[PDB]
């Protein structure tokens, strides 16, 4: 169902996605323990994910939400990092697999800081790091994040102690 | 889990670190579309 369309670096769409990725790096209170030590990324590839079924499911839900919230889907573009990225692009997000209780309970997590999502690519707290070197701060191994279109609707504001 | 009644998502907003941006949680997979797949390396600072 899913095809991946490679974007060229001269494409304005590659550039705007790269800029969102780079400009949302921050320092983390673990000194880089989970996601590694860095101030920026080397972007190797950006692919557009195309899946007609998943898109129609998304727009169908988005309209239901919008109609429940004074015609406002409250759609954002947000990062998702986890080890499940390759299953997600084929099957879509599935809340049945998102039963792990994090700080805001079970559910599907997204972040505004790309470096926050980077902390989860190798698992909770960075897991044991990359498969090849067991290094959470590996500068060699390729990582993957998703930059996703997300419908928030009416969002419960939870202030966090972080 | 499920959204708090009368809500469609949760916003987790850091209140201590004033430079940390928000996180968000949804409870239905159809409320997100994975639009871009980004392959990258982190870079060692100089
Ligand atoms: C094992 O590495 C993990 C990384 C991050 C998490 C948290 C965020 N997780 C999610 O946002 C999440 C999102 C999506 C899915 N799965 C799919 O959508 C899916 C579709 C098809 C197969 O899988 C699974 C999860 Cl666990 C990070 C903080 O703790 C809470 C869980 C949990 C485990
Ligand atoms: Zn490695």
DSSP string for B16-46: SSTT---EEEES-GGGEEEEEEEEEEE----
**Distance between B6 CA and the closest CA of chain A, angstroms:** 8
* Residues A114, A161: Cα–Cα separation, whole Å: 20
- B/e letters for A89-115, b = 16+ CB within 10 Å, e = fewer, are beebbebeebeeeeebbebbbbbbbbb
- How many whole angstroms separate alpha carbon A88 and alpha carbon A22? 23
Question: How many angstroms does the Cα of residue A120 sit away from the middle of ligand 1?
Answer: 9
Tell me the C-alpha distance between A61 and A67, whole Å: 10
Domains of chain A: total: 1
Experimental method: X-ray
CA distance to A57, A59, A98, B41, per residue, from A51 (Å): 10, 12, 21, 26
- Ligand 1 probe mutation, A1, A96, A109, A144, most atoms within 8 A of CB: A109
Ligand whose nearest atom lies closest to the CA of A136 = 2
CATH class, B1-46 region: special
Structural domain of A42 = 1-162
- Cα A7 to Cα A18, A82, B5, B39: the distances in Å are 11, 22, 40, 12
Task: Name the minimum distance, in Å, from the CA of B27 to any CA of chain A.
Answer: 5
| Chains A–B, number of C-beta pairs less than 8 Å apart | 230
Instruction: Find, in chain A, the residue whose alpha carbon is nearest to that of B1.
Output: A106
3-state DSSP assignment of residue A121: coil
> Residue A81 sits in a domain of what CATH number?
3.90.228.10
DSSP A81: -
Resolution in Å, one decimal, please: 1.8
Q: Is B46 on the interface with A (CB under 8 A)?
A: no
Residue with tokens 């902390």: A119
- From A66, A72, A83, select the one nearest A144 (Cα to Cα): A83
Mutate: best of A155, A161, A162, partner B, most B CBs <10 A: A155
In angstroms, how far is CA B17 from the centroid of its own chain? 16
Question: If you measure from the C-alpha of residue A35 to the centroid of ligand 2, how many angstroms do you get, rounded to a whole number?
Answer: 12
Distance, in Å, from the CA atom of A156 to the CA atom of A149, rounded to the nearest integer, reads: 19
């Amino acid at each position: 169902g899913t095809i991946l369309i490679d974007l060229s670096p001269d494409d304005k769409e590659f550039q705007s996605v790269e800029e969102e990725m780079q400009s949302t790096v921050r320092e983390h209170r673990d000194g880089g323990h989970a996601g590694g030590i860095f101030n920026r990324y080397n972007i190797l590839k950006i692919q557009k994910v195309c899946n007609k079924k998943l898109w129609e499911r998304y727009t169908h839900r988005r309209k239901e939400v919008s109609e429940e919230n004074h015609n406002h889907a409250n759609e954002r573009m947000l990062f998702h990092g986890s080890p499940f990225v390759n299953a997600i692009i084929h099957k879509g997000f599935d809340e049945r697999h998102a039963y792990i209780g994090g700080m805001f309970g079970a559910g599907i997590y997204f972040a505004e800081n790309s470096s926050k999502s980077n902390q989860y690519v190798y698992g909770i707290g960075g897991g044991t790091g990359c498969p090849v070197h067991k290094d959470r701060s590996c500068y060699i191994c390729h990582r993957q994040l998703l930059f996703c279109r997300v419908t928030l609707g009416k969002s419960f504001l939870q202030f966090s102690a972080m | 889990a499920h959204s708090p009644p009368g809500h469609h998502s949760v916003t987790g907003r850091p209140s201590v670190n004033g430079l940390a941006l928000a996180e968000y949680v949804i409870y239905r997979g159809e409320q997100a579309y994975p639009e871009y797949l980004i392959t990258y390396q982190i870079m060692r600072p100089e």
